[PDB]
Structure formats: structure tokens, C-alpha cells
Design a protein around this ligand. Sequence first.
Ligand SMILES: *[C@@H]1O[C@H](CO)[C@@H](O)[C@H](O)[C@H]1NC(C)=O
Ligand SMILES: O[C@H]1[C@@H]2[C@@H](O)CCC[S@+]2C[C@H]1O
Ligand SMILES: [Zn+2]
Length: 1016
Amino acid sequence: QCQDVVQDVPNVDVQMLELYDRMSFKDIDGGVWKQGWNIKYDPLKYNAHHKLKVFVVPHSHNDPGWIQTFEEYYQHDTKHILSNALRHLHDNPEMKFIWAEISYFARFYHDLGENKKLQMKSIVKNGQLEFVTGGWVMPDEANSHWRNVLLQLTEGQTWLKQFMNVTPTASWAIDPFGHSPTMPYILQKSGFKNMLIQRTHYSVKKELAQQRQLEFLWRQIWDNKGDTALFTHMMPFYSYDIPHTCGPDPKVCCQFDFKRMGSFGLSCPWKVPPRTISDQNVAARSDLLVDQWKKKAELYRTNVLLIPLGDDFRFKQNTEWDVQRVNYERLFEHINSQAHFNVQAQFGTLQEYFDAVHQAERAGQAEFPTLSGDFFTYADRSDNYWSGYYTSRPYHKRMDRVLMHYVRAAEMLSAWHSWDGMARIEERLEQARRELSLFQHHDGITGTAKTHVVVDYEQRMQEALKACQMVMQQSVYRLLTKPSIYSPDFSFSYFTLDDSRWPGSGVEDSRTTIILGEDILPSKHVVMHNTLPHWREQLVDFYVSSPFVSVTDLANNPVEAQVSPVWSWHHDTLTKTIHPQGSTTKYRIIFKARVPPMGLATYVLTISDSKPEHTSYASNLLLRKNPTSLPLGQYPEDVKFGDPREISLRVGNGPTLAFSEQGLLKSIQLTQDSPHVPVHFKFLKYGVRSHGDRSGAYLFLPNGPASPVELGQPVVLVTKGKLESSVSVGLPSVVHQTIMRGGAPEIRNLVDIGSLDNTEIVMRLETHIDSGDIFYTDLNGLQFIKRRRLDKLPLQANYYPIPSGMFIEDANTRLTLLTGQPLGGSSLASGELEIMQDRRLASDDERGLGQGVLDNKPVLHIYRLVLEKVNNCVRPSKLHPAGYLTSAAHKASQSLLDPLDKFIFAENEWIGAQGQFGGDHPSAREDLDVSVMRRLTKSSAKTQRVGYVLHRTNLMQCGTPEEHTQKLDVCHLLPNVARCERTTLTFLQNLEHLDGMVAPEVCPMETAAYVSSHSS
Ligand SMILES: *[C@@H]1O[C@H](CO)[C@@H](O)[C@H](O)[C@H]1NC(C)=O
Ligand SMILES: O[C@H]1[C@@H]2[C@@H](O)CCC[S@+]2C[C@H]1O
Ligand SMILES: [Zn+2]
């Protein structure tokens, strides 16, 4: 049956948390290998019957945006690299080249004439040009959500299958800033057999090198059996550039980068230039180079050695192709003909290297270790830990998650039907997928690009959001209109999307008010979509032009609603206070929408001349000294005023929250009898060093622990309603909001760091929880990994990515913070959680970006806070490296990442309107998600095909019986199923033809893909 992911601790040779506890992390000078040691080898190791096989693998790192935009790099550099690669590989049959970034390759190939397309296909087919990974990008591994890692991988590999007829099975990840086990998870489920990584902490490289553990079978932290394992090669040295890839001595290796002799504007910082290889020097030059190779080979277990040959945007000029190729050819001729070296060296590809490694393994020459864990937080040297980019450019980090959801929703909503080409559905979805995929680049979501490049990514993402909205609203109109009435104009807006959290109140006033009135329009239809495969009820809100509005379902059943004011916060430069103003012409109406699995539900908003029977009105209390009046137009309850004071609130039967006089949480009481548990929010600031290394987009180099933000006497606004209550406070740089709807609170921070240079703003939670040095953070929204704070490491080393959540716990109590955006965070003392909100840095951090981070803009960060008793939960043992969410924390995460979508009908009357879609869809167990639903065929295909990605998480058992659900068989969601197949996660290979055309559900922590085929 399924593997147990909780109770059995895997036995692995290397467990990265255990390794971290034992390592000392001393930064001593190792000689020419500055972070290693002087490698020694026995010359007699190699001989006539046991040669060293060397693969020199030419490559070119092409960032899809960084210090230029994608299109700028394409025009100035990448199109010439690819054009000249085609020519030089064509003309030089033993030369090889690998290529990773399919965004660029697709941009290139589609501009080729057919003669050149054919020539390109021939050098791919014959193995000279080899694709590695084949994703749209080489993604960030820290901030990216696994769903978007899969999206971009699929975008690139689907392109490659269609146009190049190849599917890579080896991955190349030389530049992401630390590495995640989510990558082998996805890759192994996508047909891969091997992967390569580079940017791991220098101390880890030393430790694993000493044990010859740089090649390993990387399995997931919970995986007892090993079925998730993927063979992984970690490169051993400081960079992927030629000085750090031939061997341990960069002064020697630089002499073999033949672009550095002067005419190209490059040189060797170790002050010994390359020399052109001639018959007079080739023996000496070869003895230098072979000795470097044999030292590198000592770090690995086979007689097969990988030597990358490349750097950023290399292999551009024809003269560069020639100078590298001709000099290496002279070296190979000499080396391979001189028996005393016992070396056979050649240009090769990545797959060629791995195939030869595994041939050695099968011949019994090596056994590889098993490994679990991750490779965060990266440091490349000294105390320079790359935890800054977990937060840099947080606006765009948040935008990533918004677009993630709208791509899912657009693909799902439109998959139910086949569309005519004139509807431009496929066109808009392809654009949306590609812009989101581009942003997964390790200079996109990471916030490590130049200002104008960030603007380009943002503009692309905005176009993608508009594309999603168009597809979604067309789809809703089709799904909810009587078929014989449906008369679409595929350019028309039948609905507009309403999003309450993006860009957010205080960031952009982009929401449309529903305008009702006796002399204009009595009522309005709205529609909610639920992308999750279970019934959901959730409060939804809209802006309306009257407070006298009531809600009905499309059976005209009244729905209870609450009306509240529309409050906006202002930085009053004449009074020097931050305080709220209420609208006198628009109001918020809130009600519970109940929406089928993967379905839609319609409601109607109707105006009346007076308070309606089933609509209540929130009270409002402004706490501040010196108040002034707050008129609210027709809102029927007058605002109350008071001096600052502690307050407590409870919605429904839910928790009771107590707040300080400054508007910040102080305690949570779960039930009426129970203790008021201390849970205190605090905002603090980190600065920058005034000597030594400065923080920048990549690096976090604080000048000591954080200092509290001075709050003064902030203005606090309390809104109390039957359905929703909140406490909001205007603090320096942050409008902080705690919202209660009857379960776990929601936190919203409108963060505007303003002109506070050299400041990082952190939000900290202080509790009594006896967590010691342990805390948990997620990896890519997929899994939670145990962290241990290490006081032998500096503060910034104890920061980890928080892509979706974090928690601390003791024997009895857990506090989980779920996020709607990836940010950096830690637990720096027992009972604490902290998460960075924004950072503004005036200096560059000396990694090549050439600017600090001075382009901050207001961002609305969102969270859920879940305090729980966990003493009755079945948790992993103390030695297990994973943790798992409870039901309530998982649902709270889903609330943030995949909320209901809201649609407002744009015209005055919707003729043929229907009340619901998907009432017959199965309501699957809470731990299962349909992560992807995508129609894979256009309308001309006689056999339509729909793909599904199913993911089951693992939730802790805590004694909530929580049961009766329906089985979900995705292959029967559409009618006329003729076949159901299990596929790789990219949909590109059929793995099993399924009996009865039934797609089984998956095991906890597993992800599977299915394709259903339909004959009508
Ligand atoms: C793709 O490759 C397979 C074997 O590599 C070959 O049989 C086939 O003709 C190619 N199909 C295409 C070009 O779609
Ligand atoms: O962000 C950049 C990388 C970083 O490692 C700094 C050195 C250049 S690489 C190219 C970019 O992706
Ligand atoms: Zn890069």
C-alpha cells in the first residue's frame, strides 16, 4: 500500500540536518583551493587498463533577464550565440554544446528560416546540441511554488517535444542560489534519471568532497524505501566558470579559458594569462591541465570526469568558438596519444557524462551514497549568506502567487469545453503560462534583477493576468448560460474579476463598485468559482454604492450579509499621523458563498430603500487621542471614538483575540474556558553594516539583531460585525490588520518602506511555546522541513525561505503562520517566529547586479495565523527530518493561495443565467487537490485529451474523525471517456493504461498525472 511518511525515519548515508548539527563550518584558507585543501592523487591510480575518461562540456549560461531584459539579451547576445552554435556545430562534428533555457531557444527557432530549422534539428538528432533540463527557465528553487516549477518545466519540454522531438532526462542547475529537494521530486516524476547542482555552501562542498559524497541518490526526507531517489551530481568548486571547473587551482584553470588573452576584453585575475597551444608548449600545458583533472577526479568515485567549459553568455563570437575549440582540440590530440597520462578526453554532453558514470557503477566500480535534505541557506564565501533574496522585491513575489492561481483557474475553467480558434483561448493561455514561467527564473521571483528588468517582468505578468481574466470570464459566461441562448462575442467582457487582495486596498484602487439605484439598476448578478475539488464556503466581499443591499441565491433564498464601511488609510502630512478615512459613497458587503467542487455559484445583490431584513451593519470604533469626526454617508451606524485601550474580540464561536493599545495581538483564547495564550506581534528593523560587507539584493548582512520600530501613539480602528471583525493600526511603514471570521485569523500588512534606506522591516511573533532551537519551514509549498537554529552560524544563516508557511511547536502547542507570498524568515529564539516584510538597501552587494534595492513599492502581504493544541496529534519521532500541517493549517494555506474567484456581471441583464455549475462533481478528501486541469488538444482533434495533476498532501492525525468523502476519478469528470492513462507530470509520456478508465487517487505526499481521452 502507501508508504507511511510519518512514523518510519529513513536510513540515509547523508541527512543534511544531521550533517549541519555535526559540521563546524570553519572558514580556513585551504591554499589554491581556497575553501578546500591541497588534493593529492596517486599517479599509479590510472594505467593502460584503467584510464580517466574526461568529458569537456561546452555551455553558455543565458539568464532570461538580469542586468538586461529578456528581449535585450536576446537581441544583443543570445541570438548570436545560438546562430553561431548552429554554424560551428554543423561545421565541426566532434564539437558539442548543451542548452538549458527554452524560452530563448523558442524565441530563436521561430525566427529561423526552414533551411536553418532543419539544420538545427539535425545537430540535435545527432547529439551535438543537447538540451539539459528543458524548462522554460532554470528556476529559482527557494521562492518558487512547486506548481510553477512544474508549469515552466512543462512549457519548455512540451515545446521541445513538438519542435525538436526530444525530452531531456538530465537536469542542469548551475546558478540558483541554493537547492531544493522539490526539484528531484518533480524531475523524477517527469522521466528524469540524473541532475546536476552547483550553488551549495562552501563548507558542505568541503565536507562531501572529503567523503566522496558529491554524487548521491537524492531522496525525499520522508521516503523510507527510496522510490523518489534521483542521481545527483554536485560540482565541487566556487563557481561554474572555467577557472572553477577544470580543477582546484583557479590560477591554473584560468589559463585554459581561451577567451581571456586580451582581444575579448577579459583577463585572468590570478595574473597568468592563457597561452595559445602550439606544438612547442602542448606537452607542458597538458601536464598542467591533466594534473588539475586528476585532482578533481579524486573527489569522485568513478573514472569518468565532468569538466564544464563555459560562463555567462559565452560562445557568442565566431572567433570565440574557434579559440576554445582549436586549443582544446590540440590538447586532446596530445593528451590522448601520450600513454603516460592514461587519459581519454573529448568534448561531450551532460547525458554522455551520466551514461558513462552509470556504466562504471554497473561494472561494480562505484557505489553511491544516499542523501536527504536541502541545500539552504547558501553562502559562497565567509559570512556572505544569500538569505536577502528570500524577500527582495516582495511586490513581485506576491504577484507570482496571484498569477499562479489565476493561471490554474483560467486553465481549469476553460478546460470544460472545446473552443473555436476564434475565441483565442489557447493563445491567451499560452501567453499567461509563458509569462508566469519566465518569472520563475532565478533573477525573476528572486528580486535580483535591475530595476528596468523588474519592470519588464511586472508588465509581462500584468498582461498575463489580463489574459487569464479574459479566458475565465468567457468560460463562466459559457458554463452558466442556457446553451440555446449563449451568443458569445469573444472580445467582450461579460464579467469583470473582483479581487479583494491584489493589488490591495492601499496599493491600487482597482476595484469596481457595483452601482445600484432605483433610477439606474436594481440588482446585480455575481458568480464565485472554486478551483478546489471539494465544496467550499467562504466569505466574499464586494463594493456597492448603497449600504441597503441584500443577497439571494438563484433560488431567491435570502443569504445573511454584513455591510461595513470602505476604510482607507492616509499619511496625513499636515497632522503627521496615519489615520483612516471612510467612504461616503461606497460600502463593503460580505456574505458566505457556497460553491461546488471545481464549480460555480451565482448570487444576486439587490438594493432597497432601507435596511434589509437579512443584512446587518458593523460597528466601528476609532481609538486615538484628539479624534475628529468620520462621516459615512448613508451608513446607518455612527462611528464611535475612544482613547487607546486594550480590546478583545470574538467572531462566532471562534477564538477570542486580545489586542494591545497599539492595535497588535497579545493573546489568543481558543475556547471559552481555556487559557488566554500569549501570542504577541511586534515589528522590528534590521540595518546594514557600516564597515565590511553590505547587504544587497542577494545578501543579508545585518548589523546585529533587530531593533523595535518606535510606534508612537498609533491610530487603531476596530470594526465589529456578526460575520467579520477586524483591528487595523497605522504603524510606521505598515498598516497592520487582523481579521476574524470565526476561525484562524487573517493578517494583512500594507507595507510601504518609503525612503527608509538601509532598513529591513521584520514582523515577529513572540510566544511561550517551548520550541528550543527547532522550527519548520516549507519547501516550494510542497513539504515542511525541520530546521535547527545554530548559534555557531551568524544570524543571516538561520534565515530560510518561507514560500508558504512556517511553524514552531512543543509537546502541547503549535503556532503556524501561513503566507500568501514567499518571504524570508526564522525562529531566532525559543517561542519566536519572524518573517521579513521588505528591505531597502542603498548599496550593491558585489555579485554583479550593480545596484542596491531602492525601487520598493507598497505591497499587501497576507497571512493566516493558526494556534493549535497538538498533544493528541500523531507526529513524527524526534529523529524524523519532516513535519506536517494539521487540517486547519492546510485549509488556511489554501484560503490564501487558491481563494474563491469573484465575477461581476458587466451588463444590466444576464439572459439565460443559471445558478450553479459542478453540483455533481465529487467532493474529494481534504488532503487531495487537482493542482492542474488542462485541455491538451485544440478543437480540430477528433480525440480530445484533458490532463490532470493530482497531489495529496499529508495531514496530521489528531483525532478528528473527519470522514465520509467521495472518491475522485478525474478520468470521468468529462463525458464520453474512451481511455485514461497515467503520465509523467508534464503529460509527455504515457506510463500506464488504466483499467476501466478509472484514475486512482494517489498516496500521501505523492503527485500523479492522468490524461483522459474523449470521443465526443
Ligand atoms: C522522434 O523520434 C523517434 C525515435 O527517436 C522517431 O521514430 C520519430 O520518427 C521522431 N518523431 C517525430 C519527428 O515526431
Ligand atoms: O544573479 C546572477 C547570478 C549570481 O550568481 C551572481 C553572479 C552572476 S550569475 C547570473 C545571474 O543569474
Ligand atoms: Zn543565472
